RNA sequence: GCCGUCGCUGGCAGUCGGCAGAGCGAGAAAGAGAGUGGCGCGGACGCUACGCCGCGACGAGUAGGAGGGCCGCUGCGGUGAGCCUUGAAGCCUAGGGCGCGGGCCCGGGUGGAGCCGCCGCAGGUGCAGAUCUUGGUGGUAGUAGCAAAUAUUCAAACGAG
RNA sequence: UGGAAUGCGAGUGCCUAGUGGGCCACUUUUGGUAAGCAGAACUGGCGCUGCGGGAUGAACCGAACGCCGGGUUAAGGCGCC
């Protein structure tokens, strides 16, 4: 909308806004990022930390997919079975222990960052953490690995 | 006969004459409206003495009798009959204006309508 | 000239690039075209599966 | 081409425009700078802050049971005057009945 | 003349909410007349709060809604909120609260719902306790926004732990001179 | 005295009426509270709450910023049972007025077919300049000038000349 | 007994235009014979600012501005203009 913006104010008065000594010329510092070493080292030190130089090694033909690991945590874990699967083994007194099958939901690690309700599960995944492995021993559970 | 408003108030306007736009007198390609001078040197916006004035916001009228003809009441334009019942709770502090394109027929049907509303109308032997 | 803080971004406009644009003001006029290319089809094959 | 080299002219009005500001005066300052081995030692003590907790209590519900024994053992003229008291809204609300039924 | 500055007058607080929504413009009607009409500054937060924008009434979780009304003290009251109450997929055992609340998620009325539970409004709140008494305010989280890790001291600058803005975070997107001791310097 | 801005994060849903009882300006934290025992059928205004009302203080301004425009231009979706050959747009006007202003409304004339108010939508949207662009017209001015190369005169004819 | 006086509501966060040629004055002050010169310090101005006075006037004296009525002043004045 042109009615609601700036430059419908700005008409009648002489400079348009932007300055009667120092005009509004074409290019009063260069094009784009043009003089990053020289006349805008203050901005591109003090706000772009680091833009200049190597590090690391390069890597040619880097495939995105061959390091595809999606991670889940044992907050969240429970939320990817139904409820009646949380609940039927509350419920339950066969110490029966749900196998939840994590990469069927999409992941392939499992980090342990939350807590974990008391019950056991058997938890089926490609890749596992050491603490994420230590709260499932701790509450009574299986970590399965599937290739 | 004349239809009196509620209450005739004295009117007091702080300023009669026109704005005049600067330097609207050696030209005719500047209209008399007015346009705040802006110019870096210019002796207008600089309230120089004895020059032309500007609409500050001091020169503001009395709310009690702003927009207030001289005859006590306050005005609305009329299109047709239609819109006098809209002002016939308001008899006594507005007026009917019939606007200009509502011809001869329509306007006579509708002075007509407003003397028995006793609405006061401001044009009423407008075209005839 | 940047401004206090923002991004160092690249803008890839240093082609003549207004002369290759493509707008897509024919997308829905393909789509019918394709729809009806697709039932022209799957009436040529009477009974024969529609997708193929 | 010779321009002014040099000024502090404006600089201390624009400096007062928003004002001089004495920092934020904060309780409980950072630790920060202090030296290494001390601030090792601080971080020993408590880290077993927590380790006399048990025998804590023991004496501040002692001292506070104590407490019982130690407080339980221990346990311009007369006419401005006078009118300041009848013209109490409530101190002289019967000085003042006493008036008004002074005139029956 | 007066040698006053006028430079801080005008007060920039809300006098209005911005929105032209006609269930929160009726509801800031029923707030503004108990904030004036009773001695209660709750009302008054609760109006005051009522203008402010979608980024300073932020979200509130399930959980710590838990964690704040499981505080000792605070129970049989209605935890009052001003923003939404959104759900959280990693608590387990949810309790019956009475809240008052402008959204509740529809995974959130559920499990509120199905804990037993009152989901009142901000018109039902006003008939029920018009000086709100029995009441806790709350507020989730206003420096939760990603927005507020880029604010402070710039980055590139002593002890300044500040996000910058990066086209993508990459071994080669500012990594190379203001971080290394090596390669130049690092703050 | 009036206009406006700012502040009081001020006041007003209490218009609580024969199902009535008309109050919250007053120096002093809190109820014109309940129960428990010793005729005449009457009463202005208000309240588009984005509204209305009351108090004080304040009011310069380039560059720049922001807001409010029931200021204006052209088209679009709605809406005015809108206006119009009993005269639309446009233009002229020693006519009447409104608004601080941008601007606007009436009257008279001219004209001959289309045009506007409101709620939203959109933008190639407001000119005094840019040695601006195109077109038109002035003072200069009945002025400069109609001066290189010797030279014209008389009578007659045609012809309004 | 909120531990001197006087005054005044403060604190904090984003986004941000214009500017980055200045000049004058009291006092101090460097170069220069000096300059309506070149160069610094402090405060106030002009620039961005009208108004009364100084006949006139960027900067001096008074005093800072919504539109008006009455009254009184500042600095300057009161033979005539
Ligand atoms: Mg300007
Ligand atoms: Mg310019
Ligand atoms: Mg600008
Ligand atoms: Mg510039
Ligand atoms: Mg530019
Ligand atoms: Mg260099
Ligand atoms: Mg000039
Ligand atoms: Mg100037
Ligand atoms: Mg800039
Ligand atoms: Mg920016
Ligand atoms: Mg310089
Ligand atoms: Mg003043
Ligand atoms: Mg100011
Ligand atoms: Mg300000
Ligand atoms: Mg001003
Ligand atoms: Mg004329
Ligand atoms: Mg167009
Ligand atoms: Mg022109
Ligand atoms: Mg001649
Ligand atoms: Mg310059
Ligand atoms: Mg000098
Ligand atoms: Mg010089
Ligand atoms: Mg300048
Ligand atoms: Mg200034
Ligand atoms: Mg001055
Ligand atoms: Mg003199
Ligand atoms: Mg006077
Ligand atoms: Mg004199």
């Known amino acids: 909308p042109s009615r609601l913006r700036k430059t419908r104010k700005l008409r009648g008065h002489v400079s348009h806004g932007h300055g009667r000594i120092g005009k509004h010329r074409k290019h009063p510092g260069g094009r784009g990022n043009a003089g990053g070493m020289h006349h805008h080292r203050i901005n591109f030190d003090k706000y772009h930390p680091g833009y200049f130089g190597k590090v690391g090694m390069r890597h040619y033909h880097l495939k995105r997919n061959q390091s595809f690991c999606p991670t889940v945590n044992l907050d969240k874990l429970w939320t990817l079975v139904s409820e009646q ?13 749900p196998i939840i099958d994590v990469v069927r939901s999409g992941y392939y690690k499992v980090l342990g960052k939350g807590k974990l309700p008391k019950q056991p599960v058997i938890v089926k995944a490609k890749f596992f953490s050491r603490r994420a492995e230590e709260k499932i021993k701790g509450v009574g559970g299986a970590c399965v690995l599937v290739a | 006969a004349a239809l009196r408003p509620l209450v005739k108030p004295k009117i007091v306007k702080k300023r009669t004459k026109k704005f005049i ?6 030209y ?4 008399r409206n007015w346009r705040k001078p802006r110019g870096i040197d210019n002796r207008v916006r600089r309230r120089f003495k004895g020059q032309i004035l500007m609409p500050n916001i001091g020169y503001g009228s ?6 207030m003809l001289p005859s006590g009441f306050r005005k609305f334009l009329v299109h047709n009959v239609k819109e006098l019942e809209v002002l016939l709770m308001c008899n006594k502090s507005y007026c009917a204006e019939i606007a200009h394109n509502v011809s001869s027929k329509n306007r006579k049907a509708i002075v007509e309508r407003a003397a028995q509303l006793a609405i006061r109308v401001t044009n009423p032997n407008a075209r005839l | 000239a940047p401004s206090r803080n923002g991004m160092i971004l690249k803008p890839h406009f240093h082609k003549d690039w207004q002369r290759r644009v493509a707008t897509w003001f024919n997308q829905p006029a393909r789509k019918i075209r394709r729809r009806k290319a697709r039932q022209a089809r799957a009436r040529r094959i009477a009974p024969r599966p529609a997708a193929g | 081409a010779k321009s002014k080299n040099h000024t502090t002219h404006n600089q201390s ?3 007062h425009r928003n004002g001089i500001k004495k920092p934020r005066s904060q309780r409980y300052e950072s630790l920060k700078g202090v030296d290494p081995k001390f601030l090792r030692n601080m971080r020993f003590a408590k880290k077993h802050n927590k ?3 048990k025998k804590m209590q023991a004496n501040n519900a002692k001292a506070m049971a104590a407490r019982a024994e130690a407080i339980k053992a221990l346990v311009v003229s007369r006419k401005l005057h006078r009118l300041a008291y009848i013209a109490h809204p409530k101190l002289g609300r019967r000085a003042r009945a006493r008036i008004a039924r002074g005139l029956r | 003349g007066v040698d006053i500055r006028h430079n801080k007058d005008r007060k920039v607080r809300r006098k209005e909410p911005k929105s032209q929504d006609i269930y929160l413009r009726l509801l800031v009607k029923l707030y503004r007349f108990l904030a004036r009409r009773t001695n209660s500054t709750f009302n008054q937060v609760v109006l005051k709060r009522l203008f402010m924008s979608r980024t300073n009434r932020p979200p509130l979780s399930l959980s710590r809604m838990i964690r704040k009304m499981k505080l000792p003290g605070r129970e049989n009251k209605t935890a009052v909120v001003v923003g939404t109450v959104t759900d959280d997929v990693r608590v387990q055992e949810v309790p019956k609260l009475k809240v008052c609340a402008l959204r509740v998620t529809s995974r959130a009325r559920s499990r509120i719902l199905k804990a037993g539970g009152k989901i009142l409004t901000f018109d039902q709140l006003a008939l029920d306790s018009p000086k709100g ?13 990603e927005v507020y890790r880029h604010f402070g001291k710039a980055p590139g600058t002593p002890h300044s732990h500040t996000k910058p803005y990066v086209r993508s975070k990459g071994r080669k997107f500012e990594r190379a001179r203001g971080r290394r001791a090596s390669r130049g310097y690092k703050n």
Not at chain 2, 21 to 26: A, E, I, L, N
Not at chain 2, 62 to 67: D, P
Not at chain 5, 133 to 145: E, H, W
């Open chain 2, 62 to 67: 009395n709310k009690k009798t702003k927009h």
């Open chain 4, 13 to 15: 009005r624009k400096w």
């Open chain 2, 21 to 26: 736009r600067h330097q609207s007198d050696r």
């Open chain 1, 85 to 97: 699967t949380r609940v039927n083994a509350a419920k339950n007194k066969t110490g029966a222990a």
């Open chain 2, 28 to 31: 005719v390609k500047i209209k």
């Open chain 4, 51 to 53: 380790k006399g907790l």
């Open chain 5, 133 to 145: 008494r029995g009441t806790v305010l709350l507020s989730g989280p206003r420096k939760g926004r």
